[PDB]
Amino acid sequence: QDDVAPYFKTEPGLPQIHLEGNRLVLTCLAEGSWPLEFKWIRNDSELTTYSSEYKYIIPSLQKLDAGFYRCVVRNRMGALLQRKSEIQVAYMGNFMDTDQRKTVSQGHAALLNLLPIVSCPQPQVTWFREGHKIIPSSRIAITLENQLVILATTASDAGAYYVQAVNEKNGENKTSPFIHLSVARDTGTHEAMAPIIVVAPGNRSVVAGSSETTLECIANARPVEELSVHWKRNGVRLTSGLHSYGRRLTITNPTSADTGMYVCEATLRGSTFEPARARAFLSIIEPPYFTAEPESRILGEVEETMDIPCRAMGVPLPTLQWYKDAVPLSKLQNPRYKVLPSGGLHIQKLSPEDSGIFQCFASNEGGEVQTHTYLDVTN
Amino acid sequence: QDDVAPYFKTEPGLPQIHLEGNRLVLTCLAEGSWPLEFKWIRNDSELTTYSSEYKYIIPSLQKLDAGFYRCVVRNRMGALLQRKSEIQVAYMGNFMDTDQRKTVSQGHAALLNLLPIVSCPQPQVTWFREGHKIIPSSRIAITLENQLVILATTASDAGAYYVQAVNEKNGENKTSPFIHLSVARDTGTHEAMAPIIVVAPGNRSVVAGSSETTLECIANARPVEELSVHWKRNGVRLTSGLHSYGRRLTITNPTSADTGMYVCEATLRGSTFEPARARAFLSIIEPPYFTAEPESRILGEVEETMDIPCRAMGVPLPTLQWYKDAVPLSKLQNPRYKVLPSGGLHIQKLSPEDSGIFQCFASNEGGEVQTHTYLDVTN
Numbered sequence A, B: 001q002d003d004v005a006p007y008f009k010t011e012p013g014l015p016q017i018h019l020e021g022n023r024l025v026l027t028c029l030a031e032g033s034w035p036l037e038f039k040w041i042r043n044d045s046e047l048t049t050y051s052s053e054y055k056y057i058i059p060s061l062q063k064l065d066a067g068f069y070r071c072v073v074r075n076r077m078g079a080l081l082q083r084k085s086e087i088q089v090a091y092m093g094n095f096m097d098t099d100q101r102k103t104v105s106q107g108h109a110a111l112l113n114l115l116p117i118v119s120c121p122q123p124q125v126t127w128f129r130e131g132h133k134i135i136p137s138s139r140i141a142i143t144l145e146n147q148l149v150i151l152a153t154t155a156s157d158a159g160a161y162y163v164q165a166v167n168e169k170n171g172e173n174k175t176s177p178f179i180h181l182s183v184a185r186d187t188g189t190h191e192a193m194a195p196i197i198v199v200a201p202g203n204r205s206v207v208a209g210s211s212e213t214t215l216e217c218i219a220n221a222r223p224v225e226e227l228s229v230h231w232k233r234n235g236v237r238l239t240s241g242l243h244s245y246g247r248r249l250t251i252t253n254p255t256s257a258d259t260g261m262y263v264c265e266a267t268l269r270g271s272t273f274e275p276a277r278a279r280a281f282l283s284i285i286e287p288p289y290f291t292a293e294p295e296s297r298i299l300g301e302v303e304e305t306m307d308i309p310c311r312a313m314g315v316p317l318p319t320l321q322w323y324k325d326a327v328p329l330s331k332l333q334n335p336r337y338k339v340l341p342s343g344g345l346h347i348q349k350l351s352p353e354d355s356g357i358f359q360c361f362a363s364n365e366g367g368e369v370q371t372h373t374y375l376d377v378t379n
């Protein structure tokens, strides 16, 4: 009857990373009764006013333009809110031009942290010692956080260390100042060192159906050539997915059967030392999906009870928030509406102002899904 | 021992769609014994020669630059091949400036196909009839392929139809030529038309863990207001996920429990007609993941048997192809190597030339995963 509330024809997709200086165009393509008006919101902050323009163009991207973008479509029926889309910008700043110093006792592991640098994403790092490149070996490792771990340091390891960082999205490179490493002699007890875990695998959670995830576990011992790092699950040692001298375990395409505890066990062959063990817990997060959605339109007699269902499942439990014509009920401050723990919304006393778009957003760490309905209040 | 075969520090990610004229930078970030050399391959065609440059820059993107890109890293040990990354370019051409004509009998459904236009992705379409916008109603639908379906056509539906197409990535719009629709009178049997499915839901397969998928089923009958389209599974009618007058069923976050048959059933209320039914089969494709990978390095005595394992799982079964220093064994034409159905590779007689990188690519419709190993041939 030419009284159709807006709805989106396009599903905003996955996060996209774009280079600086590039032209970016965002579209708010909806379907409903004409004329329609569109406005844009970035980080819960309005960018544009309502107009007939359905696209937002950034001729040259900047670091500030990055954020979560939304668009609001509105007509005589009400206003509808789009699912947020993450717009990331590729940028790489400089290091702070101040050299650092660090001293480590001989035989103990030395961890050199990548000097602070702002970059999205974090650049890949190539470590050097006075021009000579450092390759990961049995006693040298590079963490997922670009930390240089030198197991069983010696007097030959003293020197100025630096990196060449490269951003994998825009290709820019930056050279870091020096970390002057000094190795101090400790008295020669260090002939056989018990295996001790230096970088332990922390708790990790990943999205369902994702490509792969990688846990890291680095240990130190002497002699380092006899050091063996293994991975166990349910008390059973693993074989597939290992990388980088057994220090990285990659679980590819994890499901609900891959959740639980993974144990890192570092042993020293030919020795009676107790193996050093660490715990790591892998969790699978499920994106929210509705098991009950409100019908597209619902009639309502003035001052009569009304329940608007909205139930969603997924791990962890999705958190739900409502909107009335693209306005949160938390900021709407109306005692007429009352949120329901089971999922829906309860409105006991109606009013001619209650007519409009009601939108239920279910969100967790795995993203968000939204449903909506138009409340028609009879005369 | 400073003899490390190359391996990639970066995991090439999901397909990315970029606008025309934008600057694109691709990086081949690997780790191994220096110096390393890099070259780029697009659509199994070499773009650059071997050099010390690790990035490939397109200052201004074009429609021709779209394709699957790979990079090859090489040193004294051998050559390694990167997983392909899909580079899509946003472009929108024009329609062929020639109007079309179509005649449909009165009371029968009329399908108007979107006129041919080259665009990536396919644009969202807004249908018009001589300036007046056409909104989907109980007798008017728009398919996923942007087809205009007019159920129970009448004499008032005759006229020139056209569209305004908008590319959702770059925002460009194009206006289509006219489809002159003529409605021809057929003798008045058309008072109660049995429900007949016009657009049936075909077979559909989607990736595991994907956001959502949508099946479409459109039917025609008279009177159209009494037409009801429902969805059944296991003989049980569905309630959630329905859209567009019950013509679209959206299965969000499908798993192995959502595969099987979905039935579309269109009924005419208040009538004794037989419901029109259609079959649609939803399949879940699992990306390939290795259950057995070859160790990073393997020793080999000259002219001795050798088996290199490489087993992967996923639905449908992954297809495996091998490479020797980034060169396919199919094009290598060596009877020494022989592929194994169980998964691996069998080399019975060795040779000093057999030393190098061997790479096993497991690929299906859900993507590809690769493993590699260095064959060291003893003197």
Ligand SMILES: *[C@@H]1O[C@H](CO)[C@@H](O[C@@H]2O[C@H](CO)[C@@H](O[C@@H]3O[C@H](CO)[C@@H](O)[C@H](O)[C@@H]3O)[C@H](O)[C@H]2NC(C)=O)[C@H](O)[C@H]1NC(C)=O
Pocket (backbone or CB within 6 Å): A043, A064, A065, A066, A067, A068
């Ligand atoms: C718009 O909102 C986004 C999201 O809040 C802002 O991105 C934030 O930017 C900060 C730094 O500016 C980043 O912090 C990063 O997150 C980790 C979380 O563990 C933090 O520990 C690190 O320091 C890391 O740098 C991150 O991208 C993000 N922070 C959060 C909490 O989301 C963005 O800056 C906002 N832009 C505008 C223009 O408002």
Ligand SMILES: *[C@@H]1O[C@H](CO)[C@@H](O[C@@H]2O[C@H](CO)[C@@H](O[C@@H]3O[C@H](CO)[C@@H](O)[C@H](O)[C@@H]3O)[C@H](O)[C@H]2NC(C)=O)[C@H](O)[C@H]1NC(C)=O
Pocket (backbone or CB within 6 Å): B043, B064, B065, B066, B067, B068
């Ligand atoms: C590099 O290779 C890609 C992949 O083969 C090429 O993309 C191809 O481009 C065609 C049209 O140029 C497209 O065809 C499309 O696929 C469906 C498949 O059902 C087809 O029926 C439609 O006609 C649709 O247009 C598609 O993007 C793709 N085709 C295939 C089979 O992959 C690309 O053009 C190549 N570029 C260069 C520079 O070599």
Ligand SMILES: *[C@@H]1O[C@H](CO)[C@@H](O[C@@H]2O[C@H](CO)[C@@H](O)[C@H](O)[C@H]2NC(C)=O)[C@H](O)[C@H]1NC(C)=O
Pocket (backbone or CB within 6 Å): A172, A173, A174
């Ligand atoms: C790191 O980036 C700089 C640019 O910021 C590169 O320096 C360029 O080198 C090329 C030839 O090698 C010159 O034509 C350019 O003029 C240089 N740019 C500037 C701003 O001077 C440098 O080569 C990069 N390093 C690596 C290892 O790739």
Ligand SMILES: *[C@@H]1O[C@H](CO)[C@@H](O[C@@H]2O[C@H](CO)[C@@H](O)[C@H](O)[C@H]2NC(C)=O)[C@H](O)[C@H]1NC(C)=O
Pocket (backbone or CB within 6 Å): B172, B173, B174
């Ligand atoms: C479709 O795109 C054209 C451009 O190709 C738009 O025409 C522009 O309109 C603005 C103001 O409306 C002018 O400032 C530009 O000069 C126009 N461009 C050209 C090339 O003339 C047109 O507005 C778009 N249509 C819609 C509905 O957005």
Ligand SMILES: *[C@@H]1O[C@H](CO)[C@@H](O)[C@H](O)[C@H]1NC(C)=O
Pocket (backbone or CB within 6 Å): A202, A203, A281
């Ligand atoms: C990891 O999660 C487990 C779950 O019980 C918890 O016991 C442990 O303390 C967590 N560790 C960290 C470092 O958060």
Ligand SMILES: *[C@@H]1O[C@H](CO)[C@@H](O)[C@H](O)[C@H]1NC(C)=O
Pocket (backbone or CB within 6 Å): B202, B203, B281
């Ligand atoms: C869809 O798949 C089923 C599976 O058996 C098959 O029987 C049917 O013919 C297929 N239909 C089409 C249109 O491919």
Ligand SMILES: [Zn+2]
Pocket (backbone or CB within 6 Å): A017, A018, A019, A022, B018, B019, B022
């Ligand atoms: Zn880009």
Ligand SMILES: [Zn+2]
Pocket (backbone or CB within 6 Å): A099, A178, A180
């Ligand atoms: Zn200094």
Ligand SMILES: [Zn+2]
Pocket (backbone or CB within 6 Å): A107, A108, A109, A196, A220
């Ligand atoms: Zn120590």
Ligand SMILES: [Zn+2]
Pocket (backbone or CB within 6 Å): A106, A107, A186, A187, A188, A189, A190
């Ligand atoms: Zn000591």
Ligand SMILES: [Zn+2]
Pocket (backbone or CB within 6 Å): A370, A371, A372
């Ligand atoms: Zn909906």
Ligand SMILES: [Zn+2]
Pocket (backbone or CB within 6 Å): A376
């Ligand atoms: Zn009304």
Ligand SMILES: [Zn+2]
Pocket (backbone or CB within 6 Å): A018, A019, A022, B017, B018, B019, B022
């Ligand atoms: Zn782009």
Ligand SMILES: [Zn+2]
Pocket (backbone or CB within 6 Å): B099, B178, B180
């Ligand atoms: Zn004409």
Ligand SMILES: [Zn+2]
Pocket (backbone or CB within 6 Å): B107, B108, B109, B196, B220
């Ligand atoms: Zn018909």
Ligand SMILES: [Zn+2]
Pocket (backbone or CB within 6 Å): B106, B107, B186, B187, B188, B189, B190
């Ligand atoms: Zn007839």
